[PDB]
Design a protein around this nucleic acid. Structure first.
Lengths: 63, 227, 98
RNA sequence: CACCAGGAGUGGAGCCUGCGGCUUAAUUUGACUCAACACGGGAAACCUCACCCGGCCCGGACACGGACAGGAUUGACAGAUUGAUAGCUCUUUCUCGAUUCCGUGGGUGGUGGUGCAUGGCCGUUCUUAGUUGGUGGAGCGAUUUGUCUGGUUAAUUCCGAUAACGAACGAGACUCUGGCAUGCUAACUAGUUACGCGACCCCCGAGCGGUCGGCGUCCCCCAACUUCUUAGAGGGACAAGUGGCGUUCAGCCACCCGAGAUUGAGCAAUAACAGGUCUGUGAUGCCCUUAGAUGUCCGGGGCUGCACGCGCGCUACACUGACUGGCUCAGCGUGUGCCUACCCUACGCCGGCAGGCGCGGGUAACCCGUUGAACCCCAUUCGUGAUGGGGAUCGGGGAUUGCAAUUAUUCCCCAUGAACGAGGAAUUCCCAGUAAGUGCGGGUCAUAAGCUUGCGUUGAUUAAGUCCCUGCCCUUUGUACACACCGCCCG
RNA sequence: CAUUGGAGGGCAAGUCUGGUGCCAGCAGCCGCGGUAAUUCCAGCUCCAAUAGCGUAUAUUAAAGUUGCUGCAGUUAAAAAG
């Protein structure tokens, strides 16, 4: 088993969203824009080159 | 089982289930006395008769426990419907069901009351129900660090030969303590001379005798009778 | 995992379908006996049922690769109120002392 | 578990195993005479692993305070990164979501420590016949009788001494196996089948005719039986008779009735050892590991490295060697998905065997298999020549399971051709289908036996006495010994 | 607010708990402490007198262990060779 003194990082990645982070822009009442897209083609966001969402493994590429 | 196998592995499966259910019922339902079980298999049936000193434990409350456990266990091991059943019976001749008295003793000893004055009671109850010899042995430290064990014996207690297992109904058990384990063994002769429920073969492995022998003593001399 | 769930709630319907349950100790074994076509191949019995046993509303035992789970009387109300179903205590029993 | 009357052997040699010895990333622990060493289904590349390098997973409960709406918190191609097509963890992002983590209390588990903490448990005292109370009795107590001259037996089983009597357990009893069964019991799922060479077959032969001989050749089955056949009960065998001895006590040698007692295998004590079992266990008390694990999945290595010692060991040291080819001759048992992955066989088509091919019998007196089993058999050979032997080493390939054989795990060949001449140091075993020779089964498995433990054959030397050597039990009987001669012990 | 000696038997009370680990201490006798300590140091509890308690050393009784009442001499230490 774990005979070793290092098991380098069993810790899960530390997530900065409790503190402020980007979800939606703000504007005058009645028209509001997107900071990272959340419409049904949740964060439908271009991670690097694709659209994808956390758990459901949502499906699209560029919208 | 569900793969329609030879009589060899079929009888083996039967015994596998006898084994896989014995200690299940002993370590499940022993909130009472415990005596035993008896299974058999007939055409389009399979009947299992459970035998313990509380009919109500093995018959459930308003049919609940004994219609709850049975179907899950049945379908889990893989069986038809309505074939397997557990039929209750309270041991009539209780008193020399050595497993039963050993389990009552396990009750009374895990509570903390003294082993010698409880084994005297075991002996007293089995001799109440009528016996011919017994040997009850317990092991474990009754103080400290150095090992001890104690042993009670009386009567006739055959040791070698085959008739031990079926003519004394031997029984063994453990107990767990905050200080550690003790081991218990009860060996009791079977009570009934005839072949009653726990009565063994009619003859006794001993000498001959007379019930009504015959002689030829009285004078019988020449005369007749005409019928 | 514990908090995520899509194959964990079946145990309570199992426990009100019958109050005595059988289990096996293997997670390396996708095998699940006793009607395993519900898409929960003997998982999620060891996740939150343990912490209900810790309450003591059912009972458990180890032996012979088979763990035994005994439903108790005081568990019905809460093992229901997790679903808000009607208070039925009748798993299948036709009230036969047999 | 001994001697005597003999042999199969070690020990010496090739080679596989475990025990120490050196080392090693640790070469894993256990055990250390006899009752430590093919032992723990321990025959391990990988789970199987407890070991040596590196990582996933928390299934760390829950309560309390923390963090919890910029939500406490759980996912995942990217560029990285690695031993890796680990979203491990960063670049980053995304949503089960109150069923997390952070401190306390829980240590889940556990192949962490103890068998000398203990249980269930085995070896073992010693395998023998030895272990208790009742009354009564001798003893001021301990104790003792009960349990014992002798005939007498595998027996503490009898008679029998009679301060003992009435009692058991241990032996005899309790079962299996093999053996006298020409009488019993019946199987179209068994065989038979003697009967209807009837139908097929050869004329096979003298004869080449009547018939005698050989078909595991069939009869479809609503013919038939258990001689043989697997075996239920019925039933043998008890020194039973008698030739001898005693006291004709319980019995012993022999022969006629023949199976003459007893073929071997089993079953299983009291006190206990501190011998072994916590690494068969969630059998199990302390304390221990408790998020950088001894829990967990996995990859590579290790449990198999060699200057020695030892045992358990297979193959022999060749002429009764033995080489190829023929045919002379079974029962052990397992035999298709399992408590989750692979069940017992056969036919022809190829390469030589290994090995490729697909059709098919079978949940088993159906079927392999009338296991058309070897070594006994014989033809055959060169010729007392490390010799065609005893036949490794290593070379060159071929397939074969497997995620993967590299330090040959197994199979097969060409071929490599070696150490060996019945072995001095100690010792075992058996005096009867018994040793030994010995092919075959069955446990391990994805791979599978020089091991286990059974089947089975061809079957030997002398032995029928004795405690002289090592060893149980008995009696007398000395003892500073009370862990009992491995003890005290003395200057 | 009143204590002095104990809390193992002998010898009158707890098969007391944390420790400490043959370590200090107790034990006039035995032994107790060699982690599961009834002898140690503390908490409760109980034992013994009580304004007392022992400590220590002379004195006595028990004593027929001075034998006068009224010893023993096989083995125990004992009778001249």
């Amino acid at each position: 088993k774990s005979y070793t003194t290092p098991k380098k990082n069993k810790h899960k990645r530390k997530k900065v969203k409790l503190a402020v982070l980007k979800y939606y822009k703000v504007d005058e009442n009645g028209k509001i824009s997107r900071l990272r897209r959340e419409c049904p083609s949740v964060f439908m966001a271009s991670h690097f080159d694709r659209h994808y969402c956390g758990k459901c493994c949502l499906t699209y590429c560029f919208n | 089982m569900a793969v329609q196998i030879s009589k060899k592995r079929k009888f083996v499966a039967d015994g596998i289930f006898k084994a896989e259910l014995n200690e299940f019922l002993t370590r499940e339902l022993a909130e009472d006395g415990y005596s035993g079980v008896e299974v058999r298999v007939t055409p389009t049936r399979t009947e299992i008769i459970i035998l313990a000193t509380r009919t109500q434990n093995v018959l459930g409350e308003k049919g609940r426990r004994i219609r709850e456990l049975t179907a899950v266990v049945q379908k889990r091991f893989g069986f038809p419907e309505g074939s397997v059943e557990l039929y209750a019976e309270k041991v009539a001749t209780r008193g020399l069901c050595a497993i039963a008295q050993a389990e009552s003793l396990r009750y009374k000893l895990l509570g903390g009351l003294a082993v010698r004055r409880a084994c005297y009671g075991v002996l007293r109850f089995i001799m109440e129900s009528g016996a011919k010899g017994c040997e009850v042995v317990v092991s474990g430290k009754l103080r400290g660090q150095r090992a001890k064990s104690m042993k009670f014996v009386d009567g006739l207690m055959i040791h070698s030969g085959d008739p031990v297992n079926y003519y004394v109904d031997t029984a063994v058990r453990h107990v767990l303590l905050r200080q550690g384990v003790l081991g218990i063994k009860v060996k009791i002769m079977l009570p009934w001379d005839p072949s009653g429920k726990i009565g063994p073969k009619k003859p006794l492995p001993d000498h001959v005798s007379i019930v009504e022998p015959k002689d030829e003593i009285l004078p019988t001399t020449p005369i007749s009778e005409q019928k | 995992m514990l908090m995520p769930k899509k194959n964990r709630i079946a145990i309570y319907e199992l426990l009100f379908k019958e109050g005595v349950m059988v289990a096996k100790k293997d997670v390396h074994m996708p095998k699940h006996p006793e009607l395993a076509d519900k898409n929960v191949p003997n998982l999620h019995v060891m996740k939150a049922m343990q912490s209900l046993k810790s309450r003591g509303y059912v009972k458990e035992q180890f032996a012979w690769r088979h763990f035994y789970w005994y439903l108790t009387n005081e568990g019905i109300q809460y093992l229901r109120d997790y679903l808000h179903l009607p208070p039925e205590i009748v798993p299948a029993t036709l009230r036969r002392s047999r």
